[model samples]
Target: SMKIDVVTIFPEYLQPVRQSLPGKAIDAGLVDVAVHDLRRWTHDVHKSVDDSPYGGGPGMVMKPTVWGDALDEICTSETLLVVPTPAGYPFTQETAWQWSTEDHLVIACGRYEGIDQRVADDAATRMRVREVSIGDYVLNGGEAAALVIIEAVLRLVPGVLGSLLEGPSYTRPPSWRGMDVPPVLLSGDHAKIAAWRAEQSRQRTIERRPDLL
Candidate 1:
């Protein structure tokens, strides 16, 4: 089973992830997840994790000291560290699938401006560090992206999402509102169904998401 730790200033922001598949997986022992408040590493009375950027930026940048301390405490020899930001490497299903094979994954959530670059550079010495972005847009924080990544990774873990399916699937009562299930599906021809699903996936990818094609 994979183990994941998400460190964020607003732990409540990741409540959705904990309440979703990751939570269920934990209960079933398929995976282990831990959410930590970044402020835990703050030494200040106000528990601040960010400060004004050195160059006088408009927003506060997460302090490297706090992040460094947190990573130091959580990162093990083989830990895979991920920091979510718009400037990071693009995140994809392939990356998620690969991450599922790791023993420990640590996600660092940055708010306000972004994480201090030095934190990740320093972390590289001890563990594999990745700065990932889910899309081209920017977010108020990294909590949402972390959830997106966690779910994608969870789907690849054995016994978590069961089997992956293709095509537009239907349930019993295959017919409704005059819309009937495709003949190939009802025919119980596994080979044809597989081919049809592949075609369907390819066509959809081409029509809607040409970038994937």
Candidate 2:
């Protein structure tokens, strides 16, 4: 249903989670994902990706040529370019749904200070581009965020989650650590259970993210 492409300097960072849900999706043919090492596109002997900032800053900025070439080699009009950066719009479930509708998602994992802005700007000329942030906090690299995105969006693919998406579920042991399962869940009253689940989901959102309302 969807294909995810991740371009990162450290593809190893993605290996762990790649074998989790996203990997399962791949096995079932629901999704196809490929991780590429940015260095593979480098023509230089050093295969360098970063360099000193133009403004005499601290960390290195990812080179534009490298990113430009990598994108040119893989991206197409149907691809959605996702640049993971702290300055990008906050990534949420709504964003996930939006991306799930796309045929292809190409994630660029930036490291060090950040990437040359031109990489995103240039890609925008032909394909859909979205700079996204998993959270307000800063991360050392974007590879982890790419994994988070892959897992989140792929679950929305048809036949991936199937009927499990119907409602929240819990075990029959019901009581654990002195806390009991909701009485409505055990009541076996379908109508009440459904209503209780809807209310709980809304209540949970209000408590954790009132802004989402």
Candidate 3:
């Protein structure tokens, strides 16, 4: 339903999606994807995308020049450039829903100290640039986080594959862990099932991540 262009220095980070759900999306014509190696945008003869930070940071900062050119070549006004950072808002079902409605998305997978902040101010004028985090800890790179998000958000758009992607749903769990699936699911009532799911969400959130509520 939407097009996504992912820019990553480690283009290998996308192998799973190209071989998995994202590949399925392409086959089903639900979305079109293009993966670009950020190295192509580098100006140095060595073809590099990162440099030392201006503030004497510990790790290298993704060069603004590389990102500026990359975004210019790949993005339009409708493109939402998602940068995954632990400092970002936590990921959720609502975030998936919000992004699924977009007609275009751009995922920037950065490493080291992350991208230069000026890329957000200057190049992303019409782009929706937001930091998204999958969890509360540090990740080795943004590629894995980007993959986690793409798999979550892209499947929310209506399509048969989306239904299959969400199978074994807990909204109607038959039984598990010696606990019978809730009676509400088998009650022949949609409203009851919805209510049960809401309560289950609260209960599960409390049991696993109590801080959500």
Backbone atom clashes (below 3 Å) for every candidate: 0, 0, 1
Q: Considering TM-score, where higher is better, how would the candidates rank from best to worst?
A: 1, 2, 3
Candidate numbers, best lDDT first, in rank order: 1, 2, 3
List of clashing residue pairs for candidate 1: none
Error of 2 at 102 (Å): 1.7
Candidate 3's displacement at residue 72, Å, is 0.5
**Which lDDT values do the candidates have, in the order given?**
0.86, 0.84, 0.79
Candidate 2 lDDT trough over 10 residues, lowest sum: 159-168
| 120-211 per-residue lDDT for model 3 (tens digits) | 77755777787778988887688889888888886787761340111125543567778786576678999877776777666677676665
Cα RMSD for candidates in order: 3.2, 3.8, 4.9
Candidate number with greatest lDDT: 1
Task: Name every residue pair that clashes in candidate 2.
Answer: none
TM-score of each: 0.83, 0.81, 0.77
Native-to-model Cα distance after best TM-score fit, residue 113 in candidate 3, in Å: 1.4
Candidate 1 lDDT by residue in tens digits, 1-213: 788999998899888767665346677877877899998999999898888889784998899999989989998979999888999899988898899898899999998589888999999987899998899997999999999998898888887755232457887788899989888988889999889998988877777777764
lDDT per residue (tens digit) for residues 1-66 in model 2: 777889999998878655554445567776777789999888799999998999795889999999
The CA lDDT at 35 in model 1 is 95
